């Protein structure tokens, strides 16, 4: 009898270490073994440590702890945790169930209640959106009040991306502007493209931009005011609509019905994914997986290594404008107001049937959803009308 001999000789920490390697069910089973085992689990805050470990290794649990509020007590009679764990599991189950059932709140925007957002990005504090009136609006994530307005772009602000220090936007006036996310003073202006900039991405000090001029430009960002063009990628015969990248490859989707994969190392043409009947409007590349939404009303999933069409998704009655995905689902938005939520785990499996992939079709609005970003708890979208829609699932 280890659990009883170990603490008998003063090795309580060893016994607790032994019990810490158990899961939820095994832990309750051990708690129901004997009085001494129960005393060890109680005295050692075994349940609390279990919840802490879960929060440390799972995003869903983390998000729930920060949104629901019970995370405040993490990192207290030791009974609150043992009784809280079942409630947390219950909440997670309710979350996934309503995700597959279609429940929401649809919190509207609280400002003058007046439109035309082309790109949107949010966090837990603000919502940055690139309007069509040549301005950038920053809203509050909690009160939804229009916090600030950044002006200075000559044309319409098409795309944008920000981090904890700057806000890089690409407008229709063929210019890229670097703003200060804290204060809002225009820190830099890049004049290198001959036509409207359609998309841009940046991370780890490097950036990539694609404009209607059928060209791609990579930039080395040494500071918000020190950006230098490194190379000019050519090869596309049409307007490059979307461009994404990582440390391995850079994917470019243009209106020429093809996908191009170049090597980030020295901009080397690696592969070319073909199969789309029309131009590609949106795409996301991550974890060596590419998901593209084109004009053929279908969503194509591919493996960056082989470039094989793992699966084509049908059902969209219009052009798939934007699409996003995570480790669990794939949320897509086409012209007709129809937010289609698909399962990713079931899609990556070649044995699943096509009919069992489309989870739900949320239809509450009708305008062309231009942008939509989601996480494990909500979906923020923007279309022609209906300035901003928040799809909360809790």
């Amino acid at each position: 009898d280890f659990i009883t001999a170990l603490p008998a000789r003063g090795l309580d920490h060893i016994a607790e270490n032994i019990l810490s390697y158990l899961d939820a069910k095994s832990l309750c089973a051990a708690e129901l073994v004997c009085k001494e085992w129960y005393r060890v689990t109680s005295d050692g805050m075994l349940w609390k440590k279990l919840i802490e470990r879960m929060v440390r290794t799972d995003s869903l649990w983390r998000g729930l702890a920060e949104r629901r509020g019970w995370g405040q007590y993490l990192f207290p009679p030791n009974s609150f945790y043992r009784a809280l764990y079942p409630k947390i599991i219950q909440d997670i189950e309710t979350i996934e169930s309503n995700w597959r059932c279609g429940r929401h709140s649809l919190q509207r925007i609280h400002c003058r209640s007046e439109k035309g957002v082309y790109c949107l990005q949010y966090d837990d504090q603000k919502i940055v959106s690139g309007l069509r009136d040549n301005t950038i609006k920053i809203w509050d994530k909690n009160t939804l009040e229009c916090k600030r307005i950044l002006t200075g772009h000559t044309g319409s602000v098409l795309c944008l991306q920000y981090d904890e220090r700057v806000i890089i936007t690409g407008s229709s006036d063929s210019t890229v502007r670097v703003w200060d996310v804290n204060t809002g003073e225009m820190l830099n202006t890049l004049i290198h493209h001959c036509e409207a900039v359609l998309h841009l991405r940046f991370n780890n000090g490097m950036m990539v931009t694609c404009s209607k001029d059928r060209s791609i430009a990579v930039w080395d960002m040494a500071s918000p005011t020190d950006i230098t063009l490194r190379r000019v990628l050519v090869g596309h015969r049409a307007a490059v609509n979307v461009v994404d990248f990582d440390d391995k490859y850079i994917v470019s989707a243009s209106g020429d019905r093809t996908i191009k994969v170049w090597n980030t190392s020295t901009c080397e043409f690696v592969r070319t994914l073909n199969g789309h009947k029309r131009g590609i409007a949106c795409l996301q590349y991550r974890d060596r997986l590419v998901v593209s939404g084109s004009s053929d009303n279908t969503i194509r999933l591919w493996d960056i290594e082989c470039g094989a069409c793992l699966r084509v998704l049908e059902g969209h009655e219009e052009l798939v404008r934007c699409i996003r995905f995570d480790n669990k689902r794939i949320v897509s938005g086409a012209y007709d107001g129809k937010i289609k939520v698909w399962d990713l785990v079931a899609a990556l499996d070649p044995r699943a049937p096509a009919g069992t992939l489309c989870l739900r079709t949320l239809v509450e609005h009708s305008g062309r959803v231009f942008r939509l970003q989601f996480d494990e708890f909500q979906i923020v979208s923007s279309s022609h009308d209906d300035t901003i829609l928040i799809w909360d699932f809790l």
């Binding site: 040549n134 002006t151 200075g152 000559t154 044309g155 006036d173 063929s174 210019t175 202006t189 004049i191 290198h192 001959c194 063009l229």
Partner: protein, 146 residues
């Protein structure tokens, strides 16, 4: 039409005007970026307005597209930074060169043409309150040009 453009650049690099400066962006000799310094004794005092010039294939016989890059307050310039010089739309002449078009725009910066304007919401205030306009344009200049 590359020889003419090269000669124009040579002239700009030899006899530069008072408040005009235009140079190529990168390797594309057909895409230049110019600058216009706000003329003195005007609401645009001490301001630098960036432009963007794009030369067509038959530039010597076709006006080049010129567009403002920094927002401004003027009855002949909308928010999109589009300019309405009749010498740029139909009355273009092969004699006019970049150093001339930029100077013409600079002159237009001071003397606006309220008659047949591009932004009525501004031309109205100009023809009615020539005082408030002097303050609004100044504020915008301090917000973008400066």
């Amino acid at each position: 039409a590359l020889k003419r453009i090269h000669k124009e650049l040579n002239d700009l690099a030899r006899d530069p005007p008072a408040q005009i400066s235009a140079g190529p962006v990168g390797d594309d000799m057909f895409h230049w970026q110019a600058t216009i310094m706000g003329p003195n004794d005007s609401p645009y005092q001490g301001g630098v307005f960036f432009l963007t010039i794009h030369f067509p294939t038959d530039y010597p016989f076709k006006p080049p597209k010129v567009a403002f890059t920094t927002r401004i307050y003027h009855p002949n310039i909308n928010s999109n930074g589009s300019i309405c010089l009749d010498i740029l739309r139909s009355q273009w002449s092969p004699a006019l060169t970049i150093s001339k078009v930029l100077l013409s725009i600079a002159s237009l910066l001071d003397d606006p043409n309220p008659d047949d304007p591009l932004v009525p919401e501004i031309a109205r205030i100009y023809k009615t309150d020539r005082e408030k306009y002097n303050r609004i344009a100044r504020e915008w200049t301090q917000k973008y040009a400066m």
